[PDB]
Amino acid sequence: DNVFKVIYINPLVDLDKLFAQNKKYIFEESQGNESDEGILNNIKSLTDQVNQQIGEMTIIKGFQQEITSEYRSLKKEEVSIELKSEMAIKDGRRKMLSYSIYNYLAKKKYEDKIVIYLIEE
Amino acid sequence: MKFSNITIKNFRNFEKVNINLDNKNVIFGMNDIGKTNFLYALRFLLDKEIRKFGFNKSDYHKHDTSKKIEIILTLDLSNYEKDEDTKKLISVVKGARTSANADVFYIALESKYDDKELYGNIILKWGSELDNLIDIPGRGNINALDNVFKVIYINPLVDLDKLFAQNKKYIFEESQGNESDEGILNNIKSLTDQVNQQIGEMTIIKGFQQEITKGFFSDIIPYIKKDGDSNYYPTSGDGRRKMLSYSIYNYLAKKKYEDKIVIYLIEEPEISLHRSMQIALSKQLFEQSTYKYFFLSTHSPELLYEMDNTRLIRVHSTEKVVCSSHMYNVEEAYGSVKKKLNKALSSALFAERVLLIEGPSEKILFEKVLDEVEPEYELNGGFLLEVGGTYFNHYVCTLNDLGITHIIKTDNDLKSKKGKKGVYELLGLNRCLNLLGRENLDEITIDIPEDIKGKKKKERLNERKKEIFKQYKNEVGEFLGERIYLSEIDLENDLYSAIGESMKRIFENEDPVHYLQKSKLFNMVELVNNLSTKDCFDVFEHEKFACLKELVGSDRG
Amino acid sequence: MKFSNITIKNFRNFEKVNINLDNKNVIFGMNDIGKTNFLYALRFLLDKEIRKFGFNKSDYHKHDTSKKIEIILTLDLSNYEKDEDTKKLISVVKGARTSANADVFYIALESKYDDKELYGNIILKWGSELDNLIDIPGRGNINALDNVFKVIYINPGDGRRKMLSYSIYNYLAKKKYEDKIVIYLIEEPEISLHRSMQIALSKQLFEQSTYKYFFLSTHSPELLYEMDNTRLIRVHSTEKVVCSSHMYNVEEAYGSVKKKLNKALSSALFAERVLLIEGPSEKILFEKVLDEVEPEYELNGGFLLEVGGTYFNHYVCTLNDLGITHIIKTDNDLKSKKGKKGVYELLGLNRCLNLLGRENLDEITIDIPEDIKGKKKKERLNERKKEIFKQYKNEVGEFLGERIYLSEIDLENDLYSAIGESMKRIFENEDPVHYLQKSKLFNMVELVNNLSTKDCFDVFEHEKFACLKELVGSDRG
Ligand SMILES: Nc1ncnc2c1ncn2[C@@H]1O[C@H](COP(=O)(O)OP(=O)(O)OP(=O)(O)O)[C@@H](O)[C@H]1O
Ligand SMILES: Nc1ncnc2c1ncn2[C@@H]1O[C@H](COP(=O)(O)OP(=O)(O)OP(=O)(O)O)[C@@H](O)[C@H]1O
Ligand SMILES: Nc1ncnc2c1ncn2[C@@H]1O[C@H](COP(=O)(O)OP(=O)(O)OP(=O)(O)O)[C@@H](O)[C@H]1O
Ligand SMILES: [Mg+2]
Ligand SMILES: [Mg+2]
Known part of the structure; x- marks a missing residue:
């Protein structure tokens, strides 16, 4: 397992199930590569706080107050309800996007491993 | 407005049953006796998400299709001058009421099988007389009972993600003018104009893209944060995940469906709850005005610790499946000892x-x-x-x-x-x-x-x-x-x-x-x-x- | 023969937890106080289908991933030539036991984070002393702990299907698992069950010999109407997660009023x-x-x-x-x-x-x-x-x-x-x-x-x- 990495490519899977792993692989990019994205890491926290003042529109700020006020009529528990999304932007263009996603992840992550592609149909 | 009676013929284990009702109804009985089949007769009558699929062969009494299914619900409208729900009924059914002081109303369902299609069609009717029911008008997939009745069904196996996603069309999807924060939204737009042109680090992923040459509220996840901690764990237990779904249903009833009549159908709310949470849910069910119309099924005596002004329905078997009903009120002479009689009687x-x-x-x-x-x-x-x-x-x-x-x-x-x-x-x-x-x-x-x-x-x-x-x-x-x-x-x-x-x-x-x-x-x-x-x-x-x-x-002896 | 202690050194909502156990353990508590997380600590130690996936970031305390997850279980093993399950353990342990300490046993679990492959590897060790714990020998996907313990995890028209699943699980435990030590892990058996069936399940759970070893999480007092010779674990609802144990026995003087006592205390x-x-x-x-x-x-x-x-x-x-x-x-x-x-x-x-x-x-x-x-x-x-x-x-x-x-x-x-x-x-x-x-x-x-x-x-x-x-x-104040 320390030498071989097998990438299995099937067109029946979509971009969402690889994209859910890519939500933590973005954090692997920001931590890795001997802090090459450390020039961007102070201003990727600027993009992280772009997702902080989406919490102060009043359609979200009304929900954050009224759900907690509906929840605290049972036992007055010491809870809080928060909301977060954490998205990112980039049956043939999804597949051609996922081919470049697999080639990009093979170029970044697996420089120390032998990569074997199993491309089925 | 008050529920008065329901009569179920040839639906599943009910051959011919007649149950008097009220606004607040609690259903209890043994296992495999038909408490879930009683609540699904209300789902086929009043909820449009189940009625569009029709009846199968297995919805008929002892699986034979030669008998028709007929479910009739009776409403009392004797308090038109004080209640606003009665006007919400009468403003949709403006032609079918017969006498000048008709205080009763009937909503009925009939179903006859088709052997060549193997399909059970559902035909709904309403009116003021039992022998003179007319068909409900409708255009497309919408008839006129959907403008008056909203049915909220809470199963024992709620998933918070699914509910939130399905309802996310109601919340977070309004224009509302400006909301006095448009320059903050302009600062959302301006800080996205300094990230799309310089994402290359030291030209390692800009050069990888060189070699080949707004409404982001869709994936928002509600969490429960305990005070004193800042982390966001995705794993949460089933006690608070039930009660957040109950709070989301109460918020959607109090905001989006103020124009309608909201009927709750709750199957077994004691599942993965503590004893004190069952007592708090019992107080909120039987005291406050959040749940004006509910039909409740339960297996726990701790949800009946606070019961008053309640129709209790017991499903049991003597020769066939029969349901016995009782109208429950605690009197004025028992008002000081009400909690002790409720804690004694709820287990018996x-x-x-x-x-x-x-x-x-x-x-x-x-x-x-x-x-x-x-x-x-x-x-x-x-x-x-x-x-x-x-x-x-x-x-x-x-x-x-x-x-x-x-x-x-x-x-x-x-x-x-x-x-x-x-x-x-x-x-x-x-x-x-x-x-x-x-x-x-x-x-x-x-x-x-x-x-x-x-x-x-x-x-x-x-x-x-x-x-x-x-x-x-x-x-x-x-x-x-x-x-x-x-x-x-x-x-x-x-x-x-x-x-x-x-x-x-x-x-x-x-x-x-x-x-x-x-x-x-x-x-x-x-x-x-x-x-x-x-x-x-x-x-x-x-x-x-x-x-x-x-x-x-x-x-x- | 008998369980004695579980020392959860680190897991999700447990910072340092030491619980005395027995056979027939019952754990109760409030909502979100890790009653389930305790039953997953037995699944990660003993069951192989949970152990084959490893540990994530979220299985560490306060998402730290710099401390070591360690779960240590103690077995009693005090008697010989009467108990058959003791011979079932001694046979597989072989030379991992010492005569001077031949009436205690320890099964431990260690896990340290990788922070490059983002994976938590699980290493299991067994031994008769708490120092000098040696690794469990294994051939392929099977180690030698799976030749001793079989773990049955239960989590549930309706009602009769759950009793039919109990009959299927007890029939498979009686038929296919005569040569193994069977541990039942029951997660909330009061779900969609009538209270007469809860009293019947409590009588079968605390009187029959078919449930020799169980860990039972519950929310209902009617499953504790027949409790005797059991161990009770309560998870406290304070800001630090405290777990408390009591060895419950009913004496010979109280045997004529046992029913009333149990019913009353079961709600208390x-x-x-x-x-x-x-x-x-x-x-x-x-x-x-x-x-x-x-x-x-x-x-x-x-x-x-x-x-x-x-x-x-x-x-x-x-x-x-x-x-x-x-x-x-x-x-x-x-x-x-x-x-x-x-x-x-x-x-x-x-x-x-x-x-x-x-x-x-x-x-x-x-x-x-x-x-x-x-x-x-x-x-x-x-x-x-x-x-x-x-x-x-x-x-x-x-x-x-x-x-x-x-x-x-x-x-x-x-x-x-x-x-x-x-x-x-x-x-x-x-x-x-x-x-x-x-x-x-x-x-x-x-x-x-x-x-x-x-x-x-x-x-x-x-x-x-x-x-x-x-x-x-x-x-x-
Ligand atoms: N409501 C809409 N408004 C505008 N564009 C839309 C809308 N719905 C879909 N689209 C566009 O149409 C596309 C749908 O592609 P579609 O699946 O029809 O293509 P296709 O030729 O069948 O694909 P393939 O050859 O890969 O199977 C979406 O990717 C999107 O760009
Ligand atoms: N079409 C049918 N004809 C006759 N009997 C039927 C039919 N469909 C279901 N039943 C009966 O109803 C039973 C299921 O009833 P149901 O699931 O409503 O019980 P319940 O009281 O809600 O149970 P529990 O409280 O234990 O979950 C079946 O076991 C069967 O005996
Ligand atoms: N890695 C972790 N670090 C810290 N706290 C955690 C971690 N994982 C889970 N928790 C906390 O532990 C609790 C998980 O609830 P859990 O399912 O263990 O409780 P429960 O008592 O079984 O609940 P229920 O009554 O709903 O069945 C939550 O408070 C959650 O925030
Ligand atoms: Mg049922
Ligand atoms: Mg739990």
């Missing part, structure tokens, strides 16, 4: 045969005798209910309207009334005659001299109890016809009539009846701690203890 | 503060006062428990080992002896002294004329009870430090000290306290039908009813 609602005893010493002695004789009596539906001495009307009418067998074992008491000496009040006979609906008897005068005091006063009162029990023999036989077992003097004299040789052997006294009644609770534990197997069978097989033989349900 | 196990009252008249009066003053006392963790004709030790030991606050309100009595005249034993003071850890006092005798007697014998015994309460004062202060509230005569004289003008108004008699003694179940209902607001606050704010302020728990 889930039984088959209930023995109503008068204190804890009877519970100690009867639990010893049923521990030694029939130890699986509560597996088979038996229950012992502590009344408290005074409350025989409320328990017997609540258990008798639901089809639960009530058994009463009680004493013959004399009450010393307030302010007068020598004139005493008949108590146990007055309670058992008020159980039959008759008038209370007049008070009696007992001449006790002042020098006679102590055991001889108790002996004269016991001889007067023997004389009064001898006088009313036909009333005692009329009580014994209706499973009321009045003792002659006390419980301990009937216990001395059965095992009195062993009571003289254990207590080492010439008067073991008086030593049992000197301290009632601690000497009963001493009698229970020295009883044998033969003495418990001598109590159980006796004539004077037939209430235990009625409680075990056998035909031995 | 799910509380936070339990007030132990004597009878139903105290239940009528305290339910009226706690309805008129603090009606959400049952929501916040209060409970009223009627204990009659019992020496208080079973309830106080069971609720004290589990970390539940117990408050006792009681009155002193003078019980006459059988076959003896004029000799009274001091019953309530002996109950409170046996709770404190002392011995029973001597039997007092009185020279009352007896030949001439009447209502005035009750005032003579009340004067003797006042002299008993005057003589023992530092013992009453020692009871008052341990949340035991002994009355001077009765509850009724303490009620007459607070609202006695209202008792003179309602009962219209010169002796209202003597009138309620004639029929306790009837005149208490007649009393609480006629009290209102500012009588219940005068009961609640009185210094002779401080047990209600202990049960509510509103502290001034």
